[PDB]
Design a protein around this ligand. Structure first.
Ligand SMILES: c1ncc2c(n1)NCC2
Ligand SMILES: c1ncc2c(n1)NCC2
Ligand SMILES: c1ncc2c(n1)NCC2
Ligand SMILES: c1ncc2c(n1)NCC2
Ligand SMILES: c1ncc2c(n1)NCC2
Lengths: 348, 348, 348, 348, 348
């Protein structure tokens, strides 16, 4: 007996949809859901989605409140829809997927992932919910996450971090590192060996290795000396060049974090969504050095050093493909006289 | 267990709210309520009110579908709120009253009219619903309608016509002529002697007397001759004067109906609401004769003749007060040399 | 002391803005202006313009309520702005001009047309308002209308009809036929010889000549015989050909009116604005004969006969230019063996 | 002579409504009020209320700009409406009350609180405005605030802090501590002995006692030792338990402030309004420990210590009612073997 | 071949409009432009302007991404429109000018500034774009900026700072200090000698002189002693008086910055636009001292000291006009016994 007033009752009393019985008075005006409290309207939800306000309200209330894979991972794995849950995309303030399965009568394409409409779609399954590992085994297409082993299925160890209510974290009181499994056309697919992005923020950036501590503490020339990075263009790629009108390099988040401590800069997120590589229109406030499309990736500095040091530096220009977050990231490598000139996530 | 989905289910299956159990998927977008039918959205309701879309939807679904007094009568009698029903105002496409009693959780000020919040409000009671005659008997303020006699209380015979789903009609299969009772501060009022407006349309106008048949059939001069109306300015007041830039007279609906048969005209309803006297910005299409504020009343021609023939014609200008639909309508009477110059509802 | 509440007071009490003092409570919700009447909101105005709701409300309230030239005439004469009035475009439900002069503080570019900002704009002047003939005399660019003669200036007799509150009519109680004058860069122009469109409706079409009476009364072959129209393709151009999937001809409003009496058809007005030539996507309901772009002109049948009879019929295809409503209308004339095949307004 | 353009003139020139004469051009688009400045539109107000945009604009402009009681206090005292002022609710960005008295023609239920419509409503009166103490004496229901004594009326000393333009502060240049008086059904009511919440922020939290300084400075075990809190579950209730998936305790704002200094966390305010007890969906970013409904109260630590130490610890579970901000706050007390297990504001 | 889908393609791929060929799917809902990415809608733009959403999207995409004069300077110089660029006003989130020249088909009044419609408008020209210095020489009205000298034109050295993508900065990698030129009615105008505002923020305020360092570091009485400011009311004007209900003075941004370090305060920007002098409704959080209209200017402290010390202190009250940002700023000077009482930017 699903209703707008019951979803609102659950939000008000339980903090989210919790299957509880009850109704609260609701008013919908434009794109906002309000509830009456002591004679006045109190805002419960502001629709930022392209779905109808009451529909987006129910999907948000029905969001998964357990640690779930970050939307960039689900996207990189080709996930189309989730089985009997809503993965809320906090970066877009919208459902991560267009349709649902057994969640909301307006967006449901099926009540169970076993329905034939779900066979061509890559359904996300959560091994923490009863019966979902079995539903993945019977699914034609799907991605499964588990906390432990599944007899016969070869696991892929995912990232350490997961998203819990929009907070990306490495769990201590909860498990956030999952085993990942994928099936394409009824066949279990081998997930590739991959690096993982660290999902850190510029404002609250923390080093996760002795190399990262040394990058943030040491001066540019002594860090490059200590880590034998001469001829790898870290001065351009990681530290950044703010001497010309066009900002040079600055493609690693740790380099932006180091700069941010000394002077501020504007990062225009012109495609605001979760992705392995992010594109920003950057304007350095100290110098006025700027770049319309500055691709940034948050790799652990050691992982980036390992990628660039593994490269052959004998050709003028080549596409270097690196698996990051299960996806193929093309990098552009420019060399001269056996030294790196630039190395950046190739702007497609 | 009131809900948006249940109100929508009732509209789709029963044509209105009928207390039936069930839910249909609903989407709200801007001011419209849609329901999904075979994968596509079908419009159920377009909000024309100043209330939230979902709230207006429920009050419209919960509208009274029996013949009810026309909103102009309820307003003239000082009705503030209705007891356990919604009087839908079809002229405004909105509820006739701001609040409800035992109807909708968002608009309810009380569940029963016996609650102390209803004591100072003139509550509308319908003697056709069980226990409402007794709720009026106990009420401090109220208006009661009945189909027959009430013990001890003397009735005021109302108009022949009532509104059934927005259709104003004189019932043949249903009773539309009610007895009216009114209480102010616990005292049963003596409702005054009143004329009633006829609530006719210009396009489907029907005469309701031999004088009205003769007005529409005969020529102007022979009707005035037959009914001894010389000196009463019917040529100006009722027939209308389209010879000058400002349209002269034309204050009786029957006169507009007669004109409408010969040539069309635009009637701008600049305050669209139900009222005893209506104001229109009229433009006669044949002549180009026009008037910004042309007050029109739909009185039976015989009743209008009685009013104008019962006035003293010895003063240049005076206010003539007439009880019409229980309200005091002021008219402006202009005379010269013992004859009428003009007579018009000075009301809005 | 202009205000929203004062404009609303004027609309409610005077039927339009009349400079009266007073205020009524107003509420604005989305694109609608409401006013409170006995505790409930009554709609005063629904904004159909691309201007802000309160601004469009004031321009509509301040609309010219005298017979004014039809917007197609003002446009054809290059009118940019009106002097101290608003020409309301009833076909678009919007002001005919972007800006105003001495009308509304939000849209005013000047308070008087003598301000230098108005010098390059063709200002519309109304000789019926005191001092406007003299403001046109001093203006660099302008269009003047008068009811009589102007000293020294030679007139161009305009169309018989004018628009009074959106009703196009030939005045009997008011004058609708104006003298037109135009100045370009300080020089009084000689307005060209022009035909005028008749501005009739399909539903209320009336013949304005003995030829038009004969077209509507007689059969196709006897009308063409009586008026010696053999070889002029009136069967195709005026009567219409509904025998093939593509509707043939039907470019004169009188021909659509004749057809409309026998059987209905849909006319999709895909560019809804006032213009000399109109384009309709027509679907004949009886036959299913249709045409995406069917250009229709409302010319007096005698004027259309004069145009087609004054053309050289010796070339396969050529452009025929005709001054209609002061503008140059291009027609496409197609001939074969000295007879007309088709003739149609190539205009939009 | 109230108007939209006059309210806007006052906002632009005086920073709020100040009864000044004048008008500025205004445009309303969707839910925003703009004014023209140097040819471009400048936003004056964005409507976040469920009232029409122009109406909410006027109530916001007419907001009380003197220190006023925090909305949680007015609500806890049953205040329905204010006398001749608007208490703006900055937490909701909306008027604290639905209707007004002598403020705005659209929301006014009366011009003076002496009107009979105000008798059943608890009207807020401000003794700092001339004649309001007398109006409270004549009011059937009301709440009065004063800066000093009222002859014969027994005062209740309110909180030290008040809200001045949305800034909660303890006044040094202005008086913020008021005497409070309440009347129910014509009878002056004795306000109960009460504790007061401190109205502090997590980000700018300041200790207001030596115990609060010691809580934030000392380690958990030495604070509990110093203040003899062994057996009172401060480790769970105040410090918080982040070791399991469900976050344990954390019901006192000072405990959240201490945690906030070490590591961040998300507090989802799912019912955003001012209240004595707040409910948050909390997610600890360091551990991933979370709780859907975590009730938080900002009491001075000494006051909380006094409440819990006053409890009988001999029963398994009991409801403990404490008067806070004039309202009865139910707490849930869970004991075992003469020691506290948990003590929290009971989730209703 | 301009289109919505091409503008969106440019935003997604180039970070702004870059004349590139291509189309991406777009959806417009209410005031937001979305693009489809991996089956879900991603927000590209939220319209905060009074222009249609698709039109504002194109003007924002077509914004000037080079360092440009701050909107306060362009306004103070009477700039109406820009030549073949869009100056985006980041403080209003809207175009700085109503119309464009050769930018967008919906807002263009002309394709080239040489068109006669641009002659009466003060067109902004950028000497960094080819042919714009010549277009300024031929323009009747205009403002020109250059990086170097223009043969024969007497330059005005502008402010050190410019706006690059909404970041006000003094360029190190780019030039931000321009030469300014103005023409009124075909005649090159001599720009006056002027002081410049510093365009600093309260939160990230940095001193730009030894006097400014001493103001922020030293105590009030020793700074006034060191700089011989006795009798100049710096205690009131610059430091601020928070002892009474009305906040005294506090008209220099550096004084607000010094206060901000010790205690917070709310600054209500009730007219949010870029201007030489700003007006704020300020509420000091520590004391509750407040002022509805507190005019603030960010002059370099030395420049302010120079202005006030240059004043004659022998009259009770006088208007003192100072040229700041090319505009005449009226100050109010109040003296008594040869000493300053107050000196503030006169509230108009
Ligand atoms: C594209 N981006 C950067 C570089 C390049 N091409 N050649 C050397 C450096
Ligand atoms: C106003 N209205 C109508 C009339 C009048 N004044 N004098 C004669 C008739
Ligand atoms: C285009 N439209 C009409 C016609 C034509 N081409 N050829 C003969 C008649
Ligand atoms: C509800 N909440 C917490 C507890 C309880 N019941 N029993 C002991 C601890
Ligand atoms: C206006 N504002 C401040 C002052 C004044 N007038 N006289 C002395 C001080």
């Amino acid at each position: 007996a699903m209703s707008l007033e019951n979803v609102a009752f659950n939000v008000v009393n339980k903090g989210h949809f919790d299957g509880q019985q009850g109704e609260v008075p609701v008013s919908i005006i434009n794109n906002t859901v309000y509830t009456k409290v002591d004679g006045v309207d109190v805002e419960l939800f502001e629709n930022k989605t392209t779905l109808p306000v009451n529909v987006a309200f129910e999907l948000w209330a029905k969001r998964n409140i357990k640690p779930v894979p970050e939307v960039k991972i689900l996207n990189n794995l080709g996930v189309d829809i989730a089985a009997n849950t809503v993965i809320w995309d906090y970066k877009r303030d919208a459902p991560a997927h267009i349709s649902t399965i057994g969640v909301c009568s307006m967006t449901d394409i099926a009540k169970k992932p076993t329905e034939t409409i779900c066979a061509p779609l890559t359904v996300f399954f959560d091994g923490r919910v009863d019966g979902q590992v079995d539903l993945f085994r019977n699914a034609r297409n799907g991605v499964l996450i588990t906390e432990g082993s599944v007899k016969g299925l070869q696991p892929s160890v995912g990232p350490k971090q997961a998203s819990l209510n929009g907070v990306t974290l490495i769990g201590e009181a909860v498990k956030t590192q999952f085993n990942y499994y994928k099936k394409v056309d009824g066949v279990v697919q081998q997930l590739p060996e991959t690096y993982f992005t660290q999902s850190r923020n510029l404002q609250e950036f923390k080093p996760r290795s002795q190399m990262e501590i040394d990058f943030l503490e040491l001066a540019m020339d002594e860090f490059i000396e200590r880590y034998k990075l001469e001829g790898y263009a870290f001065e351009h790629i990681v530290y950044g060049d703010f001497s010309h009108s066009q900002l040079g390099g600055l493609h690693l988040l740790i380099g932006l974090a180091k700069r941010f401590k000394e002077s501020p800069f504007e990062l225009e997120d012109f495609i605001p969504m979760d992705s392995t590589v992010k594109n920003y229109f950057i304007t350095d406030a100290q110098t006025g050095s700027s770049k319309c499309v500055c691709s940034v990736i948050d790799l652990l500095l050691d992982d980036f050093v390992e990628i660039i040091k593994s490269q052959d530096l004998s050709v003028v220009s080549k596409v270097v493909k690196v698996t990051i977050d299960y996806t193929e990231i093309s990098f552009m490598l420019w060399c001269k006289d056996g030294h790196v000139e630039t190395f950046y996530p190739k702007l497609q």
